[PDB]
Design a protein around this ligand. Structure first.
Ligand SMILES: Nc1ncnc2c1ncn2[C@@H]1O[C@H](COP(=O)(O)OP(=O)(O)OP(O)(O)=S)[C@@H](O)[C@H]1O
Ligand SMILES: [Mg+2]
Lengths: 608, 448, 319
């Protein structure tokens, strides 16, 4: 009722010919009265009861758009939805929350200052940053909502220096473990995937899902399959478990390379696999859903693969042979259109590593689901930017034996000390590589200057690269004038970092660039070339919006990710001091700087 | 005044002192009589009195028939058990093995009291059966406890746990060790009398030997058992060093490490796996350096626990310190435990990388705090009851001025003569050497 | 930085100071880039070190760098040894006339005397006629090294840098050499002169100059293997020495062990004995505690005594 009330009140408020409108208004009034009078013993706690009251009441009086001002109805509703999103016993569900957020955040209104903001303290931002990032990962969100989300994320990072954990995960194992919960089988995972289609689809999709569930539950009740019964009784709530039982009545090439590049590889392969096992009632009702519903095959691929492989374990192992023969070609596939299916292959291998093989002694037998060349899988996962997965595969490969991919893994994995454990032949060049990885100061400047002189004197073509390295080094020190002179003799980050440090506000900044230095530079340049605070606020808000859009773009390593979060924090501090109105606000800004210093003393040095 | 302001930090010391030793006992008895007279602490001292009496009675009660090693007995079938449960219901206290932080506001009301006891208690293998009680607190958490009786000395273990905690607190003042959260995991030892104590049962760990001995036969069914390796090493104990080293090589050629699986079967997600393996390597490095500097010995597989929620190691039973272990009949001549199984859990770059760098950061921060470590050991020097040698009772229980010498050895292990790199190189060389591991005692499972 | 950001007028002077500093190190490319953004000694020292032979040199200047630069430039832009001799002699004459001019402090005085010494070494190698004269010039360099180990650092660094320029220019200019002096001979003598300078710079604890020299030597190995020279072991040992003197102990040890594993120390110009290599590895492994003292004696010291092969006299056996 919470989700239905929220969605219905939102769609009515948008809907609000004359007689129909008066009828809609009278229904709106009756429904709001009913909800105000609603009270149930089924509320888990009294926190849920107050959440229900607040959600329903604030939804009853919202406007057409949403804002973030402190004390309005739209902002109280947004804050309630966000606070409810991050919880364990949550009132709303994904479709109702998506409807509410697409109504509020579709056309937004970010407050000018931050004293009038619904999130204004560093603690509110630290508390709500994870949920606000989870929210601004849609496509129906305005620009002002993305600016507001950037302001919240930037304040959270400036107050804690910690990345929200959704941005740091690289596999999908958390979702596969959230779905296949209660027992831990693939049948529960597929049942949850199919159940979520009843409440979130259109007419057609919900119809397909209800048909599938009726077939499955009926054929599990009649045939007395206890495993599938235990799956259903824990995947479905009781009202849906009863409406799926026909109690009196009766129920009315992919396996080859270059197929990894069409955007429907997963759907075709899932259908081809599920058709090969008719005796499993959960795979028999799939091909309709897999072909019709969009994005279902990618979410259901591991469960289907596991169900087929587990079914034909003692019989003639056909899918194992076919998949293990194709993987030798699919894993060695460097392509941009094929990267997103390669990620799904790697996630399927990972998921199969967590499923117990019947009649096994150890976990070292879960290498028999498929037959994967772990060196190829490690290289593939290094191409996709999954470096911890790549390290795990490299270790499994090394076990299979009893170093060109290990270098690319250890240069990019997120640990201070791991890189130093790799062995590589010694020379002045390798010591220089280690010193530039380490971001040393004068120590890399010495070796780089020697290389650079020797390459200028010999008219070598590497001197260009040498100069590049030098500029990088000279920015990690603080020597900005030297790097300026080295740039004027002919990077992007270096150019605009040096221009901002020396305060050279007349560079023509590129537009639509993924560099944090350019974003911050454009904000400060606009601050230099402007006579009204409104132009500067507009430039800061455009910067926040673009930075959040770039963080949502996906494939970023951890250094680039933290650079973008630091750009958000810088733009937020700029916006904070631009909006001071008196002396007390100035002293409060200074005290905020001091508390953040408390966090900064121990944090990572690049961010600080 | 300390016992009045912070009663859960002083009143167990007073109880142990009351219940030049005669003068100490008399003075502590006068302080106890005065404590049971004032209004601030008058409902707390009788509770601790009665509760410690029943805990000690339960500790001392050993009956081979009523308490079988390995079973799980409901604690109501002895008179001691029922007296214990009644007294514990009538007197509410915080769990004696709970670590309470000191309150500047002097308010100890937010501390969980013991609500009830789980009906049963486990029993471990020994003569004086150590029983593992469980207490359900008011906040609804489970505090397990070893109620240890016998003729052991828990005051050594408690003093050394305090010393190790103080040095690990020193580690937090430096950028490199604080950036990596290098430190040790603590537990709580509470000596009740000279023959009994309560030890905090660390929550969700598993002993290193209890994981490693089943895993070795689960993953390598053609290898020797652990008992066969132990027996083959013990038979060649009264022979020359050449024969001992030959037998040791022969035994470790048929015994392969399996520690890398601990992480693959408790953390199948690669993100969690990588973080937990890093935790393991870092805590091992910190305790290795810290236990070299303080001479920590007796580092066999039953004193090392693996935390299978965070991946880190916990070292318990820290009483053989200051090189007391190389005085035993079969001496322990290694700086720390770095067998093939400890190194197998560190990954594909075995000791290079995280382990060696963290050893160097730890040692570098330690020899930059040699004055504070000197202060801690000096405070130890004015402790009348701390023994600087290992009495033949425990020396027989282990293998089937003394303050000035010990503190001078500690002070010369912290000297800046060599570099940290060279020192760590020498330590890792002598900790993994086959000629040093082959002459270790067989109960110190070096083959493992 | 603080003067560029504040649009202060002192930044000019700052830049000047910086260029001066960057020449006292050996970082010539950085000072070149700082000069192109707009002194005389710095300009022509940097041009000579980077070998930029197209600067228009002023005439009648009291700078030693301009004199030496004009001599080397003439050596670059000339097809007859007589033009180069004339330019060297004009340089010597002008330098003496400037020393006679009187009011010079001691630093300028010693700079002029070092210019004279540089021009004299240039004139000496321009006039070699056969191989015996080349070996005599190399032996002269060694005796002067004996004096140089203890001398003042400014004079030593100046003379040694000019000597490096002389040897490289002579190795490049094939028409200025006599008949029976092939390019392999010129290359070998350049390598030997560089290794000598690296010893001298090592005693002075000049880290950046040993780094510069070992980098410039490592860049000569490709163009030495096409002339038929085997000089990789001595050049890689110089690189290992530079690493060890900057504090990279394990990198130096690994580099020396690679020299010992895959290299033929017998068929090697600029020879290198296997026992001095083995004892160097043993010493460095003992200092770093990289192996137990029982494997150091088994792998490095007893093999070295066995490599001596009964010879019990000399400096190799002494070491
Ligand atoms: N504080 C503790 N927390 C968790 N486990 C513990 C703790 N103390 C001991 N253990 C473990 O519980 C078991 C009880 O062992 P103990 O009886 O204390 O002594 P022991 O080491 O097992 O036997 P010996 O003869 O001393 S080798 C062992 O497996 C220990 O590793
Ligand atoms: Mg023990």
């Amino acid at each position: 009722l919470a989700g239905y009330a929220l969605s219905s009140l939102a769609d009515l408020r948008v809907f609000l010919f004359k007689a129909t409108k008066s009828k809609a208004q009278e229904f709106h009034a009756w429904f709001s009265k009913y909800l105000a009078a609603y009270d149930s013993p089924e509320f888990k706690d009294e926190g849920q009861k107050q959440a229900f009251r607040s959600i329903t009441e604030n939804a009853a009086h919202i406007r057409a758009s949403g804002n973030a001002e402190k004390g309005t109805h739209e902002s109280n509703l947004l804050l309630e939805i966000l606070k409810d999103w991050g919880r364990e016993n949550q009132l709303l569900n994904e479709p109702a929350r998506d409807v509410a957020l697409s109504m509020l955040c579709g056309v937004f209104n970010i407050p000018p200052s931050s004293r009038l903001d619904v999130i204004e303290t560093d603690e509110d931002a630290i508390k709500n940053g994870a949920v606000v990032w989870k929210s601004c990962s849609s496509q129906r969100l305005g620009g002002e909502y993305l600016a507001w989300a950037g302001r919240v994320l930037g304040r959270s990072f400036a107050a804690s220096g910690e990345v929200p954990e959704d941005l740091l995960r690289e596999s999908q194992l958390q979702e596969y473990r959230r779905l296949s919960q209660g027992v831990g089988s693939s049948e529960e995972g597929l049942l949850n995937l199919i159940k979520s289609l009843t409440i979130s689809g259109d007419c057609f999709t919900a119809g397909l899902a209800e048909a599938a569930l009726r077939t499955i539950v009926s054929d599990a009740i009649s045939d007395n399959d206890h495993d599938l019964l235990s799956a259903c009784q824990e995947s479905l709530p009781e009202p849906l478990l009863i409406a799926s039982n026909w109690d009196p009545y009766r129920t009315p090439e992919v396996f080859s390379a270059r197929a990894l590049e069409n955007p429907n590889w997963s759907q075709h392969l899932a259908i081809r696999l599920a058709l090969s096992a008719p005796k499993i009632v959960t795979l028999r009702v799939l091909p309709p859903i897999l072909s019709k519903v969009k994005g279902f095959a990618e979410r259901a691929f591991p469960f289907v693969v596991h169900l087929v492989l587990a079914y034909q374990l003692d019989k003639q192992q056909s899918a194992k042979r076919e998949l293990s023969e194709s993987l030798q070609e699919w894993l060695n596939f460097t392509s941009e259109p094929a990267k997103e299916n390669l990620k799904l292959l790697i996630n399927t291998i990972l998921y199969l590593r967590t499923q117990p093989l019947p009649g096994e002694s150890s976990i070292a037998d879960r290498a028999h689901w498929l037959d994967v060349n772990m060196a190829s899988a490690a290289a593939a996962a290094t191409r996709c930017g999954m470096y911890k997965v790549a390290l795990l595969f490299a270790e499994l490969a090394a076990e299979s034996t009893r170093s060109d991919i290990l270098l690319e893994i250890f240069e990019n994995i997120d640990d201070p000390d791991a890189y130093y454990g790799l062995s590589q032949d010694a020379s002045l060049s390798t010591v220089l590589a280690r010193l530039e990885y380490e971001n040393d100061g004068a120590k890399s400047l010495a070796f780089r200057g020697a290389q650079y002189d020797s390459h200028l004197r010999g008219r070598d073509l590497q001197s260009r690269q040498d100069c590049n390295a030098l500029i990088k080094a000279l920015s990690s020190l603080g020597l900005a004038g030297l790097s300026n002179s080295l740039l004027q003799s002919q990077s992007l980050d270096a150019t605009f970092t040096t221009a901002r440090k020396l305060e050279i506000w007349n560079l023509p900044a590129p537009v639509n660039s993924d560099s944090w230095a350019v974003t911050v530079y454009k904000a400060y340049q606009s601050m230099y070339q402007a006579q009204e605070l409104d132009t500067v606020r507009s430039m800061v808000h455009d910067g926040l919006k673009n930075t959040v859009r770039h963080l949502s773009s996906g494939s970023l390593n951890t250094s680039v990710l933290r650079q973008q979060l630091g750009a958000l924090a810088a733009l937020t501090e700029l916006d904070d001091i631009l909006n001071v109105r008196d002396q007390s606000e100035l002293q409060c800004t200074l005290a905020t700087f001091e508390k953040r210093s408390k966090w900064m003393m121990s944090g990572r040095y690049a961010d600080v | 005044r300390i016992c009045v302001d912070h009663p859960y930090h002083g009143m167990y010391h007073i109880w142990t002192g009351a219940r030049v030793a005669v003068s100490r006992q008399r003075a502590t008895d006068k302080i106890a009589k005065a404590l049971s007279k004032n209004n601030k602490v008058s409902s707390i001292w009788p509770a601790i009195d009665q509760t410690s009496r029943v805990y000690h009675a339960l500790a001392m009660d050993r009956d081979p028939t009523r308490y079988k090693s390995g079973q799980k007995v409901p604690i109501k079938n002895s008179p001691v058990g029922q007296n214990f449960l009644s007294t514990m219901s009538n007197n509410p206290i915080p769990p004696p093995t709970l670590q309470i932080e000191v309150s500047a506001n002097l308010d100890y009301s937010h501390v969980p009291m013991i609500h009830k006891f789980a009906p049963e208690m486990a029993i471990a293998s020994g003569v004086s059966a150590p029983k593992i009680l469980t207490a359900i607190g008011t906040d609804g958490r489970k505090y397990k406890q070893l109620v240890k009786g016998g003729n052991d000395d828990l005051r050594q273990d408690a003093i050394m746990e305090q010393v190790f905690a103080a040095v690990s607190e020193l580690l937090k003042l430096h950028r490199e060790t604080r950036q990596r959260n290098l430190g040790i995991r603590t537990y709580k030892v509470l000596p009740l009398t000279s023959s009994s104590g309560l030890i905090e049962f660390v929550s969700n760990t598993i002993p290193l030997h209890e994981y490693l001995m089943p895993a070795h036969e689960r993953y390598y069914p053609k290898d020797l058992k652990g008992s066969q390796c132990r027996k083959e090493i013990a038979n060649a104990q009264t022979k020359n060093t050449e024969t001992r080293i030959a037998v040791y090589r022969r035994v470790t050629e048929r015994f392969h490490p399996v520690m890398r699986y601990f992480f693959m079967e408790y953390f199948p997600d690669p993100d969690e796996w990588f973080q937990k393996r890093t935790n393991y390597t870092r805590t091992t490095a910190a305790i290795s350096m810290l236990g070299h500097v303080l001479g920590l010995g007796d580092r066999h597989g039953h004193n090392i626990l693996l935390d299978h929620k965070t991946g880190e190691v916990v070292h318990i039973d820290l009483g053989v310190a200051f090189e007391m272990g190389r005085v035993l009949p079969v001496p322990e001549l290694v700086p720390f435990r770095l067998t093939r199984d400890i190194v197998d859990g560190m990954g594909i770059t075995k000791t290079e990388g995280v382990f060696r760098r963290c050893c160097e950061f730890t040692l570098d921060a330690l020899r930059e705090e040699a004055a504070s470590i000197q202060t801690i050991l000096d405070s130890l020097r004015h402790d009348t009851l701390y023994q600087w040698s290992i009495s033949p009772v425990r020396m027989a229980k282990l293998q089937n001025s003394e303050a000035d010498r010990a503190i001078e050895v500690v002070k010369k292990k912290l000297s800046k003569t060599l570099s940290v790199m060279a020192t760590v190189n020498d330590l890792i060389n002598q900790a993994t050497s086959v000629s040093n591991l082959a002459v270790l005692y067989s109960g110190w499972a070096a083959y493992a | 930085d603080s003067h560029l950001r504040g649009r202060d007028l002192q930044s000019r002077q700052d830049c000047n100071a910086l260029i001066k500093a960057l020449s006292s190190l050996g970082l010539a490319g950085l000072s070149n880039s700082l000069l192109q953004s707009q002194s005389l000694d710095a300009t022509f020292t940097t041009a000579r070190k980077l070998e930029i032979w197209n600067l228009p040199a002023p005439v009648n200047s009291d700078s030693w760098a301009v004199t030496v630069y004009k001599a080397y430039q003439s050596m670059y832009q000339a097809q007859e040894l007589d033009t180069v001799r004339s330019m060297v002699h004009d340089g010597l004459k002008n330098t003496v006339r400037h020393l006679s001019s009187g009011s010079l402090n001691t630093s300028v005085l010693r700079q002029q005397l070092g210019a004279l010494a540089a021009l004299t070494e240039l004139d000496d190698i321009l006039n070699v006629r056969d191989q015996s004269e080349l070996q005599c010039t190399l032996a002269t360099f060694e005796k002067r090294s004996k004096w140089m180990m203890s001398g003042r650092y400014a004079d030593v660094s100046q003379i040694l840098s000019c000597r490096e320029t002389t040897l490289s220019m002579w190795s490049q200019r094939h028409n200025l050499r006599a008949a029976g002096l092939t390019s392999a001979d010129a290359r070998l003598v350049q390598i030997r002169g560089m290794l000598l300078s690296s010893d001298i710079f090592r005693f002075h604890r000049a880290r950046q100059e040993t780094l510069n020299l070992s980098t410039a030597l490592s860049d000569l190995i490709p163009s030495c293997e096409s002339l038929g020279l085997s000089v990789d072991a001595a050049i890689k040992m110089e690189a290992a020495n530079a690493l060890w003197d900057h504090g990279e102990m394990i990198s130096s040890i690994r580099m020396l062990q690679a020299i010992d594993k895959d290299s033929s120390l017998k068929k090697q110009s600029v020879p290198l004995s296997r026992s001095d290599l083995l004892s160097k590895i043993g010493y460095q492994v003992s200092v770093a505690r990289l192996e137990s003292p029982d494997a150091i004696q088994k792998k490095y010291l007893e093999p070295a005594l066995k490599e001596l092969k009964g010879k019990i006299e000399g400096r190799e056996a002494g070491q």
